[PDB]
């Protein structure tokens, strides 16, 4: 939900006996297929933009700029990880292609299928279709009653 | 077709103009920090070598098929026919190298567009171009396939005419 | 010029560590990554710290010159006068640094476009201004921007 790692603890030991369908957890930070030549930035985090499209947010001028969940004509990148202690968000610029699990809007998530063009809303959630090239590579997976994730490939601007 | 393409009875006969080969190294100017990805391609539909390709997520794997500029994922720079694997430079990266064209008479500096077959054509065909492609050299024919040196740098803001 | 070489007779007092980086001789970018693509190209004129377009024509190889708009190709971040070459970050690579602005009207939160002279002017969009325009000398204004492409 609001944390990459489960906020509550667990009362059981994992079986660790199977190898299939084990990467669906929300704590799976980063991309699924990553290149060593990827440009990675970091920014101060305003809110929780984890696994969402991020845009630049400024202030009066007394403090440096930061990144907040957003999209549309102001999209700047995609957040793939967050260090909570330092309040830092890892950003992959939109000029660098990305492939990984991203948050999907809980509206018509069943209609999302592989090959469906997607775009970022004002809250940084992927929504079914403008100016950003993103393609879904799988179907929506439910983590919470309001949390759905989809594997997507973002490859620049239209 | 293929890239390597055969026993010869005799050997084939300056340093200038020796790069005009179908199986030449695609990148005229390479660079570390260039991202290269691997995908599967259809071994009976279209040969994607030196063509603009698009991602087609199939029911068993994500393939790359020759595609137009409107839905282009990148440029296929090399193919391994033994494993039928295509190597793709994403459109987010710059490219300067030789690509397959269908017009045997293209001059230098002309604006170009990729058609539905992943083939370089003149941008005056009518479809609104969405990618910045420029001809760095005149098209040359290898006897037959037509090749041309092009520079591709990102998408175009507003589609041209 | 990027580094106007002039001999002096007295040393200039330089001890303060603040307001020392905003200068016309500070090449490169404020933040740079090892995986940034750089290309050296022959140039004409002086496109230093400006948007550069590739001009193609004894026939010579294509060069670069100050420009922008639909012909925008990259940004010139460093120059070598002896070799008459310019280091260029391609438009497909994001950049953060001080660039030449047309005038002082540019302020923070302003969307900026590269004009026909390679200068950043207020409103496709190419950059987002980070600070106000500062006059280095005469009519030379430098503005900190974070280039992200073309809209």
B30 touches chain C (CB under 8 A): no
Question: Dmax over Cα atoms in chain B, in whole Å?
Answer: 54
Q: How far is CA C42 from the centre of its chain?
A: 16
Cα–Cα distance between A59 and A101 in angstroms, integer? 30
Total residues found in chain B within this entry: 161
3-state DSSP of chain C: CCCCCCCCCCCCCCCCCCCCCCCCCCCCCCCCCCCCCCEEEEECCCCCCCEEEEECCCCCCCEEEECCHHHEEEEEEEEECCCCEEEEEECCCCEEEEEEECCCCCCCCCEEEECCCCCEEECCCCEEECCCCEEEECCEEEEEEEECCCC
Cα–Cα distance between A42 and B121 in angstroms, integer? 41
Contact A48, A103 (CB under 8 A): no
Q: C134-137 and C127-128: which strand pairing? A: unpaired
- Give the count of alpha carbons within 13 A of A27, CB side only: 5
Residue B71 burial (10 A CB sphere; 0-12, 13-18, 19+): middle
Please give the resolution of this entry in Å, rounded to 1 decimal: 3.3
Method: cryo-EM
Contact A100, A32 (CB under 8 A): yes
Cα–Cα distance between C47 and C65 in angstroms, integer? 6
Tokens for C58?
Answer: 């004894």
All residues at 6 or more sequence positions from A47 whose CB lies less than 8 Å from its CB, including other chains: A68, A69
B137 touches chain C (CB under 8 A): no
Q: B62-66 and B37-41: which strand pairing? A: parallel
Tokens for C8?
Answer: 């002096």
Residue C52 burial (10 A CB sphere; 0-12, 13-18, 19+): buried
Compute CA distances A154 → A148, B76, C55, C124, whole Å.
Answer: 18, 18, 31, 20
Contact B129, B159 (CB under 8 A): yes
Contact C85, C104 (CB under 8 A): no
Integer distance in angstroms from the first to the last C-alpha of chain C? 32
Sign of CA dihedral B79, B85, B86, B89: negative
Contact A134, A75 (CB under 8 A): no
**Using the 8-state DSSP alphabet, how is residue B23 labeled?**
T
CB atoms within 10 A of CB C12: 5
Instruction: Count residue pairs from A and B with Cβ separation < 8 A.
Output: 37
H helix runs in B52-114, sequence order: none
Q: Per the CB < 8 Å rule, is A58 touching C108?
A: yes
Residue B54 burial (10 A CB sphere; 0-12, 13-18, 19+): buried
Residues of A in contact with C93 (CB under 8 A): 39, 95
Contact A89, A43 (CB under 8 A): yes
Residues of B in contact with C150 (CB under 8 A): 154-157
Q: To the nearest whole angstrom, how far is the Cα of C151 from the nearest Cα of chain A? A: 7
**Region for B48 from its dihedrals, namely left if φ exceeds 0, alpha if ψ lies in -120 to 50, beta otherwise:** alpha
Contact A152, A100 (CB under 8 A): yes
Q: Chain C residue with minimal CA distance to B93?
A: C92
Integer distance in angstroms from the first to the last C-alpha of chain A? 31
Cα–Cα distance between C54 and B116 in angstroms, integer? 27
Q: How far is CA B76 from the centre of its chain?
A: 6
Closest CB from B33, B134, B155 relative to C37: B33
């Amino acid at each position: 939900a609001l944390m990459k790692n489960p906020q509550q603890d667990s009362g059981l030991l994992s079986n660790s006996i199977d190898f299939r369908d084990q990467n669906l957890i929300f704590s799976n930070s980063g991309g699924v297929c990553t290149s060593s030549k990827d440009k990675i930035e970091n920014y101060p985090a305003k809110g929780y933009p984890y696994k969402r499209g991020v845009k630049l947010s400024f202030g009066d001028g007394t403090t440096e700029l930061e990144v907040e969940a957003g999209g549309g004509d102001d999209l700047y990148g995609v957040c793939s990880d967050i260090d909570e202690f330092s309040g830092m968000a890892t950003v992959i610029p939109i000029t660098n292609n990305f492939t990984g699990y991203l948050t999907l809007k809980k509206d018509g998530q069943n209609g999302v299928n592989p090959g469906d063009k997607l775009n970022f809303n004002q809250h940084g959630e992927l929504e079914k279709v403008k100016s950003v090239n993103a393609i879904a590579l799988s179907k929506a997976h439910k983590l919470t009653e309001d949390l759905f994730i989809v594997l997507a490939s973002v490859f620049g601007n239209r | 077709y293929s890239k390597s393409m055969i026993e010869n009875k005799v050997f084939s006969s300056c340093f200038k103009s020796k790069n005009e080969r179908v199986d030449a190294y695609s990148f005229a100017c390479s660079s570390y920090t260039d991202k290269i990805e691997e995908y599967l391609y259809d071994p009976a539909n279209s040969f994607p070598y030196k063509r603009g390709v698009k991602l087609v997520p199939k029911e068993n794997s994500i393939y790359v098929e020759v595609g137009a500029d409107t839905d282009m994922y990148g440029i296929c720079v090399d193919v391994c026919e033994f494993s039928c694997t295509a190597y793709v430079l994403p459109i987010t990266n710059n490219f300067e190298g030789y690509l397959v064209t269908r017009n045997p008479s293209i001059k230098i500096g002309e604006i170009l567009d990729i058609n539905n077959n992943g083939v370089i054509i003149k941008a005056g065909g009518g479809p609104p171009t969405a990618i910045n492609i420029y001809a760095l050299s005149d098209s040359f024919t290898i006897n037959s396939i037509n090749l041309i040196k092009v520079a591709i740098f990102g998408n175009r803001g507003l589609e041209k005419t | 010029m990027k580094n106007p070489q002039h001999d002096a007779s007295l040393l200039s007092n330089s001890n303060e560590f603040r307001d020392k980086n905003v200068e016309f001789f500070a090449s490169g970018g404020t933040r740079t990554s090892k995986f940034d693509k750089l290309e050296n190209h022959p140039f004409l004129g002086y496109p230093y710290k400006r948007g550069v377009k590739r001009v193609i024509q004894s026939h010579y190889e294509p060069h670069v010159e100050a420009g922008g708009g639909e012909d925008l190709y990259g940004i010139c971040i460093d120059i070598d006068e002896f070799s008459k070459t310019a280091t260029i970050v391609p438009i497909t690579n994001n950049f953060e640094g001080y660039l030449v602005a047309k005038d002082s009207t540019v302020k923070v939160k302003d969307k900026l476009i590269f004009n026909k002279d390679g200068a950043l002017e207020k409103v496709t969009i190419n950059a987002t201004a980070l600070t106000d325009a500062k006059q280095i000398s005469n009519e030379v204004y430098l503005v900190k921007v974070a280039v992200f492409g073309n809209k």
